[PDB]
Amino acid sequence: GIVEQCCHRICSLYQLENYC
Amino acid sequence: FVNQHLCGSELVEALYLVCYER
Numbered sequence: 001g002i003v004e005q006c007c008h009r010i011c012s013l014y015q016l017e018n019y020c
Numbered sequence: 021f022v023n024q025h026l027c028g029s030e031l032v033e034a035l036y037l038v039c040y041e042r
Contacts, residue, residue, distance in 0.1 A: 002035075007027035013038060016026070020039035
C-alpha cells in the first residue's frame with residue numbers, strides 16, 4: 001500500500017498520485 | 021522526485037498537494 005511504497009520504501013511522484 | 025521517504029504528516033501533505041486540481 002501507500003505506506004509500504006512511500007514511507008517504508010521510496011516512491012515516485014507517479015506512484016504517489018496513483019493513490020488519489 | 022526527491023528520493024525521500026514520505027511518512028506521517030509529510031505523506032499527508034504530499035498527497036493533498038499531488039491530488040489537487042483547481
